[PDB]
Amino acid sequence: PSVPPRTPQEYLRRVQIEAAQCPDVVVAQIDPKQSVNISLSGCQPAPEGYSPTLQWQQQQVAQFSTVRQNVNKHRSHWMPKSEDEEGWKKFCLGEIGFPPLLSIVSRMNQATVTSVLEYLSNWFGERDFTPELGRWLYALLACLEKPLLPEAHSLIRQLARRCSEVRLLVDSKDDERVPALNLLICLVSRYFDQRDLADEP
Amino acid sequence: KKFMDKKLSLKLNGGRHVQGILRGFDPFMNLVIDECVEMANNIGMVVIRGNSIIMLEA
Amino acid sequence: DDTALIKAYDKAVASFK
Amino acid sequence: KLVRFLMKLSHETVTIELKNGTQVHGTITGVDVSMNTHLKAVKMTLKNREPVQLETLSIRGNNIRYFILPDSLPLDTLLV
Amino acid sequence: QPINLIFRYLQNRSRIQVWLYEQVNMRIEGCIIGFDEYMNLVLDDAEEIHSKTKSRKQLGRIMLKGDNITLLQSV
Amino acid sequence: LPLNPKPFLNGLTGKPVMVKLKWGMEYKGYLVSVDGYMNMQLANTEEYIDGALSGHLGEVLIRCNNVLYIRGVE
Amino acid sequence: PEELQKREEEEFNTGPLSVLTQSVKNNTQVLINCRNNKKLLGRVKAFDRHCNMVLENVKEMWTEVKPVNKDRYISKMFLRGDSVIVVLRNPLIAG
């Protein structure tokens, strides 16, 4: 009672009893700043008119799926080195360079598919968008199996960001680039689940 | 029951080893080890937790 | 069709209307 | 409570991050009350490996980092 | 039994050293003035004891969580 | 006069604390709140990695499990 | 009883889990530090005593080798509380 305790289980009963008399939760009112966490940007919206309609977006996504099925037929039938940024750039784009034939993309493993995408993004930041570039990106995207690594998700968002910026330079929809850019943006944004980047018109 | 008062060496998590003689234990796998030596040193009597004891051999 | 991809791409671009 | 919600997710396909960072895509066959998950039609993405198909896989609740859920998933419904 | 040994450390108010689960480069040292069934310990006049560096940081009175405990000794 | 863990904890609310985490980071702030499971809420929170002031986070919930020890500060 | 639970929800409107019930009540965003060594910025749709969480519109943010910010987006998510370290109320973010 008022003694102290002599065995532990007693003490513990003692402490337990005490702890049920305590309030369970306790809020203390106080009387009176923050760092910032950088965060990478969304896509740049499309100039007025340049935005593709939902049915077109859904048309390609569907279409792109089917394409990726085909890609696994060849992939059953089985080049610069994986780390060769320079030779991969040359190989694909050239000066010309090699197109993306199933022959070739079907021989590339995923870690390479990924690398290469990186290289063509680093080329794309500092050079202009050709149609040749266009095919490659689209191919490497058709060779990317999922579920994607986080690192790979970040890559293709970077790439889609880089497309939307370039789309602001354009001055007529007649530009060759516009369709290609809208596509890649749509595929990352809808096929690869990054719908924060999507062009909801 | 019959590791009791029988010398033994323990392997603990984070890669640590311990040599002493089992003196007592409970349902929760906690131990009392007597005359214990840290194998990197005599450190007397010590309470070891249930977990944190990867291996336990004589 | 070893160039199914290059073809698919062009069809897809092209299909913009 | 929230695990009640998980248990309503049979035949939903999801991606799971493991604590080792492995991404695991498959279709839920069942979730138990301690978050242990059985999947089928499974594709496992590894840091320095190619992928792995598997007919089935079951996973301990305490090896999961999180679940990525299908976007179409209707949450407000299932939160009841 | 082990609880008896912890309890004993409470009666004597012994100075003890704790082996941390998650952390091997460091131990905690203090006099024990309370605990509970989760083995959470109120710990008086406490010290972080570094390894290699032979350094000791005064904390004062701290509450140590029970899940962190690999091992308890006396000092 | 044994001081036991919950009462000790309850006794810290309102006041400056240094919570230190099982993974090495620690958090100084005014312990606003506390619950059954020893989750905690801090205000005017400051993060220390390696012991180097890292961030100013304002208000912050800390999950119970991650905590190593908590102590008072002046 | 079972209505005593109700004590649970009062315990949420106050006490450190308020942080989350803020987000659920107001459609506010939180910032969660996770063990994966990444940060999640999203809205809380639901949560329990363990900080298991349903999230919406999550950005997974991290840096990596000088160091480059990386991110990724996640429409809907079930986060195990285990993975949680801290949670910021009213975080501050900038492009």
Residue numbers in the entry:
A (entry chain 2): 42 to 73, 79 to 124, 135 to 151, 174 to 279
B (entry chain G): 10 to 49, 55 to 72
C (entry chain M): 35 to 51
D (entry chain A): 2 to 81
E (entry chain E): 16 to 90
F (entry chain F): 3 to 76
G (entry chain B): 13 to 77, 88 to 117
Mind quoting what the paper says about this structure?
The assembly of snRNP cores, in which seven Sm proteins, D1/D2/F/E/G/D3/B, form a ring around the nonameric Sm site of snRNAs, is the early step of spliceosome formation and essential to eukaryotes. Gemin2 is the acceptor of 5Sm. SMN binds Gemin2 by its N-terminal Gemin2-binding domain (Ge2BD, residues 26–62). By binding the outside of the horseshoe-shaped 5Sm and constraining it in a narrow conformation, Gemin2 helps 5Sm select RNA substrates, allowing preferably the cognate snRNAs, containing the snRNP code, to assemble into the inside of 5Sm to form subcores; the assembly of cognate RNAs widens 5Sm, which in turn causes Gemin2′s release and allows SmD3/B to join to complete the assembly of Sm cores.
After we failed at obtaining a different crystal of the original 7S complex by trying different solution conditions, we reconstituted Complex A, a 7S complex with a short version of SmD1, SmD1s, in which the C-terminus (residues 83–119, which is invisible in the previous 7S complex structure) was truncated, replacing SmD1. Complex A formed crystals in different crystal lattice and its packing is significantly different from the previous 7S complex, however, Gemin2′s CTD is still located in between the SmD1 and SmG of another complex and the distance between the SmD1 and SmG is little altered. In addition, surprisingly, in one 7S complex crystal structure with the full-length Gemin2 (Complex A), we observed that there was no electron density inside the RNA-binding pocket of 5Sm, in contrast to the previous complex structure where Gemin2′s N-tail is inside the RNA-binding pocket. Complex A was crystallized under a condition similar to the previous 7S complex, but has a different crystal packing. Checking the components of crystal sample by SDS-PAGE, we saw the band of Gemin2 keeping the original full-length size, indicating no degradation. So it is only reasonable to explain that Gemin2′s N-tail was located outside and flexible in the crystal of Complex A. These data indicate that Gemin2′s N-tail may not be located firmly in one place; instead its positions may be quite dynamic. Consistent with this was that the peak of 7S (containing the full-length Gemin2) eluted earlier than SMN(26-62)/Gemin2ΔN39/5Sm (7SΔN) in gel filtration chromatography (GFC), indicating that Gemin2′s N-tail flips outside the pocket and increase the complex's size.
